[PDB]
Design a protein around this ligand. Structure first.
Ligand SMILES: O=S(=O)(O)OC[C@H]1O[C@@](COS(=O)(=O)O)(O[C@H]2O[C@H](COS(=O)(=O)O)[C@@H](OS(=O)(=O)O)[C@H](OS(=O)(=O)O)[C@H]2OS(=O)(=O)O)[C@@H](OS(=O)(=O)O)[C@@H]1OS(=O)(=O)O
Ligand code: NA
Lengths: 238, 29
């Protein structure tokens, strides 16, 4: 996170870190959505231009900073994930080897329904991005930044990448008075918003892509969680 | 999960975090 601040203890108990198993290195952020399911970006697992195709034997997740380390049973990547062109449908689900124990530092975030998404997804409304990634383009504390949702035509005019309805963008405009963005290591992490209707946090987006971190006139792009909920529902079953 | 989105160290203890108001401020313009 660029231009953020230290998060208070227990601020994001759904925070998950995706780690390379060997050699061990932080790869991506992720989010806890149940005691057994973890949400992240597809490009964190599969990205052929960088020769990246991680399996369950290549990865570990870290949750709760009290801390929990777990293997993955299965990886689910959206079948229409489009890495060649624009990272359309940049979403993947990680099934944990076994269900984890919940605590003060480990707690799942909510997924939004139609009504929640209609209420919260308006240009100007701020969401929250958290992660352990770079401060500049190695924090010892989870970092947090709050960022405003941006008008879709402003998002499209900021980049040459074709923007689909499965993406939104967020971040300050040049001269808006503030800065901030996800950066290397935060990708796959959650963009959350607090609902006034029921006092709960919902994950609205997944850090997907940007063109540099915290650049004037550029915005972060996030996988639109509600619009991919049909696929989320299908794989999780229950 | 019935208890999703409610953090034990905040909402469950009726303590709001330090930058929550920034989000609620953005809701009313
Ligand atoms: O609260 S949710 O976000 O979970 O919203 C529920 C989803 O309902 C959808 C699902 O589309 S579907 O996959 O094609 O079925 O809309 C449509 O289906 C539901 C349920 O169908 S079912 O056969 O009864 O199970 C209907 O809602 S419900 O009242 O039955 O719960 C919808 O009717 S209605 O519009 O609510 O009156 C029905 O809409 S439609 O006739 O296909 O237009 C999704 O709505 S959608 O986002 O417009 O596609 C909702 O979102 S979801 O992500 O698919 O869960
Ligand atoms: Na920017």
């Amino acid at each position: 996170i660029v231009e953020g601040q230290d998060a208070e203890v227990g601020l994001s108990p759904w925070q998950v870190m995706l780690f390379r198993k060997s050699p061990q290195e932080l790869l991506c952020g992720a989010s806890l959505i149940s005691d057994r399911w973890v949400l992240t970006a597809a490009h964190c697992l599969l990205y052929p231009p960088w020769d990246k195709n991680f399996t369950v034997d290549d990865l570990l997740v870290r949750i709760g900073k009290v801390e929990k380390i777990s293997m993955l049973d299965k990886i689910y990547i959206h079948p229409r994930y489009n890495w060649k062109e624009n990272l359309d449908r940049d979403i993947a689900l990680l099934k944990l080897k076994r269900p984890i124990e919940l605590s003060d530092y480990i707690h799942p975030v909510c997924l939004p329904d139609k009504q929640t998404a209609a209420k919260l997804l308006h240009a100007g409304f701020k969401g929250r991005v958290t992660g352990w990634g770079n401060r500049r383009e190695q924090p010892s504390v989870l970092q947090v930044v709050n960022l405003p949702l941006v008008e879709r035509p402003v998002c499209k005019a900021s980049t040459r990448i074709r923007i689909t309805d499965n993406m939104f963008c967020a971040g300050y405009k040049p001269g808006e008075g503030k800065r901030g963005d996800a950066c290397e290591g935060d990708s796959g992490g959650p963009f959350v918003m607090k609902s006034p209707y029921n006092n709960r946090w919902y994950q609205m987006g997944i850090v997907s892509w940007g063109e540099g971190c915290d650049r004037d006139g550029k915005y972060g792009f996030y996988t639109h969680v509600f619009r991919l909920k049909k696929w989320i529902q299908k794989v999780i079953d229950r | 999960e019935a208890d999703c989105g409610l953090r034990p160290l905040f909402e469950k203890k009726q303590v709001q975090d330090q930058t929550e108001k920034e989000l609620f401020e953005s809701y009313i313009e």
